[PDB]
Every structure is written in C-alpha cells, then in structure tokens.
Amino acid sequence: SGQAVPSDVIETRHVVNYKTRSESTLESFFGRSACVTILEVENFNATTDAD
C-alpha cells in the first residue's frame, strides 16, 4: 500500500498525539452482547400434534 505520511509531502508543525486506538482492538470491537436469534415457546393445554 501507499506508505507516505504528511511530513513527507508538506511542511508540518510538531503535534503531540495522546490519542489511542483502544476502542478498535478486537476485544473492544467485539465487546458487546448481540442478539443472534428469537425463539418462541408457549404454555397451554395442547390437544393436537401441532399444538
């Protein structure tokens, strides 16, 4: 892939970057309970095979 960064092609000031990629680690990306299905069940006096 292309590798160049801004300092390679413009005049840049110094900027200290304190920001982190914490929320895009795999654990962070997947760290959610997600609904994967909805099941149905009932309780009544069933008199047919279907019921």
């Binding site: 801004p6 413009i10 005049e11 840049t12 000031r13 110094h14 900027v15 200290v16």
Partner: protein
C-alpha cells in the same frame, strides 16, 4: 512618576497613549500566547503573520447620546476587513487570536456618564421572531 492613569501600548507599527486610564484588565488573568505542541490539533505548519496583522485597527466611531442604549461587536467579525489580519483570516480554514481592546471616550470635567465595557465569551444573542 509612573501612574495607573498613564499608559502606552505598542503593537507592530501602531501605538496608543492614554493619560486617564484605570489600570488594564487581563481577562481571566491570562495573557494571550501561541498554541503549544502539546495542545495542538491541525498538523500543517501554521502561518503566524506577526506584525502585519497583530496591530491596532481603529473601527468607525459611534456617537454616545443621552438616549443611546448601547453597542455590540463580535470578534473576530469586527476585524474581518482589517488589513492583513482579514486576509490571513479568510485565506485559512482555521485561526486563533487574542486581542488588546482599547475603548476611547473623552469628555470634560463638567460632563458625566458611565459606560460598562464587557468582553463576553460565546456571546450568543436572542433572535427577533
């Protein structure tokens, strides 16, 4: 010899004198300064126009009458058409600035009146509908 009433301010090619001042305010006790590397955001090398733009610009005067209710300006809006400051402002997406504001109103020892002069951060005003 030196006095709270007598002051000179020089910025760039411009100087103000006053002989009837009342000290000076430094808002929130903090003098303006350039943006430190540890607080910076855009990464391009900034333009710092220095004396071309950091100088006294005098606005059109207004008239105080017994019936006047007051005046407002916004900043940097009030200076948007002022020399090289205006040019640097409009040629760039981003800008920051501090200010020395000098409000001038002389009269005589027989006149009376008092003006409140306020610098208000984020001076959001009501609409008229």
């Amino acid at each position: 010899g030196y006095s709270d009433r007598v002051r000179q301010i020089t910025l760039g090619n411009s100087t103000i004198t006053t002989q009837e001042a009342a000290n000076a305010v430094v808002a929130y006790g903090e003098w303006p300064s350039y943006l430190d590397d540890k607080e910076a955001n855009p990464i391009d090398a900034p333009t710092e126009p220095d004396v071309s733009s950091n100088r006294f610009y005098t606005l059109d005067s207004v008239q105080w009458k017994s019936t006047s209710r007051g005046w407002w300006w916004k900043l940097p809006d009030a200076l948007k058409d002022m020399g090289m400051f205006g040019q640097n402002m409009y040629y760039h997406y981003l800008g920051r600035s501090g200010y020395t504001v000098h409000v001038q109103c002389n009269a005589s020892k027989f006149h009376q009146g008092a003006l409140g002069v306020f610098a208000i951060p984020e001076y959001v005003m009501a609409c008229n509908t």
